[PDB]
Amino acid sequence: STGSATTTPIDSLDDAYITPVQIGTPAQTLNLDFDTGSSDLWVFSSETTASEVDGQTIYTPSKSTTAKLLSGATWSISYGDGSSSSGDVYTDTVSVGGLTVTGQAVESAKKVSSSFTEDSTIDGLLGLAFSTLNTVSPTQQKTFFDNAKASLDSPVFTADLGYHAPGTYNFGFIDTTAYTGSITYTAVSTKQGFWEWTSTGYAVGSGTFKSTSIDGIADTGTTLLYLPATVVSAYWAQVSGAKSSSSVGGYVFPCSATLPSFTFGVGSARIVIPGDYIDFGPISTGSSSCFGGIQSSAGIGINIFGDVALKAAFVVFNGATTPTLGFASK
Numbered sequence: 296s297t298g299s300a301t302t303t304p305i306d307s308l309d310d311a312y313i314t315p316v317q318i319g320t321p322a323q324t325l326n327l328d329f330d331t332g333s334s335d336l337w338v339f340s341s342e343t344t345a346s347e348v349d350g351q352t353i354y355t356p357s358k359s360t361t362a363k364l365l366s367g368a369t370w371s372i373s374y375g376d377g378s379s380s381s382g383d384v385y386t387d388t389v390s391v392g393g394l395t396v397t398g399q400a401v402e403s404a405k406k407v408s409s410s411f412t413e414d415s416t417i418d419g420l421l422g423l424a425f426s427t428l429n430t431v432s433p434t435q436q437k438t439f440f441d442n443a444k445a446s447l448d449s450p451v452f453t454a455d456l457g458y459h460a461p462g463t464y465n466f467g468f469i470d471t472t473a474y475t476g477s478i479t480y481t482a483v484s485t486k487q488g489f490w491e492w493t494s495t496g497y498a499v500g501s502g503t504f505k506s507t508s509i510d511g512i513a514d515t516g517t518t519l520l521y522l523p524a525t526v527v528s529a530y531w532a533q534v535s536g537a538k539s540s541s542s543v544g545g546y547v548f549p550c551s552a553t554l555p556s557f558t559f560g561v562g563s564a565r566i567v568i569p570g571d572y573i574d575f576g577p578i579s580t581g582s583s584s585c586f587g588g589i590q591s592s593a594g595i596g597i598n599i600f601g602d603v604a605l606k607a608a609f610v611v612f613n614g615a616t617t618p619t620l621g622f623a624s625k
Contacts, residue, residue, distance in 0.1 A: 298394025319359030330516030350415030500555030511598030
């Protein structure tokens with residue numbers, strides 16, 4: 296089997312991407328944030344505190360003939376950005392782009408933090424990291440991808456995120472028409488539950504490439520590119536007037552600037568992030584100070600290849616017995 300779904304930016308800055316997901320019988324379609332940095336499939340639901348719902352589409356398990364309460368199971372998750380959610384658990388039929396899993400754990404939110412409430416366009420998350428991070432207790436549950444894996448033509452999914460435009464998540468096959476040149480594969484460590492890999496270095500604009508190992512995670516659920524402070528300083532030093540602002544919470548730059556590209560290494564290959572991808576616009580409406588898309592990972596504890604980086608590539612998440620990551624230009 297295979298699946299193929301379109302993923303769409305939630306706003307004009309590509310802050311996140313939503314992908315339609317069918318849950319239950321008859322289908323209830325929710326728009327979920329596919330997140331390769333976590334491993335819970337959770338949804339706004341009929342059980343969510345009413346004051347914490349503001350425009351989201353909710354899953355109503357009582358209206359699904361295939362929904363079954365997973366007796367005794369609860370979940371609770373906190374994310375890197377400080378947001379959180381929790382609730383109880385159903386199993387139900389879940390389909391993504393024609394690919395169907397029966398008995399998928401669907402985690403029903405009773406509580407969500409304000410950040411989720413305020414984002415009316417995101418109805419939940421669909422985790423695509425390794426199932427070892429799944430927070431369901433007392434019986435840990437598998438991700439959609441883990442459940443689908445044995446049925447897939449090939450045990451892979453791919454992320455093809457668009458810049459200010461729709462893109463694609465595919466399951467079970469590699470679309471050889473979706474990228475240019477070759478795919479370069481690189482080793483993955485699952486020791487922390489993430490798609491963790493080591494970049495071979497970087498360049499700023501037309502500058503020389505610096506060979507240096509950068510350990511980080513491929514995370515579709517993080518907006519920006521978070522790298523070591525040395526790297527990030529070298530980038531923003533090439534932008535006149537750029538500075539790190541503690542009051543704003545990162546690097547800002549004059550909105551009149553033209554940003555340089557940023558290149559990262561995948562083995563001997565190179566992925567080029569165009570400068571425009573690094574512009575996240577005015578810090579506040581009407582401001583002439585703009586927020587940078589490359590930020591320091593210092594104090595996160597890990598480097599994160601988020602959407603800013605991933606959308607410059609066709610990315611293969613290979614879930615074979617020995618997982619790997621592949622990157623191609625497109």
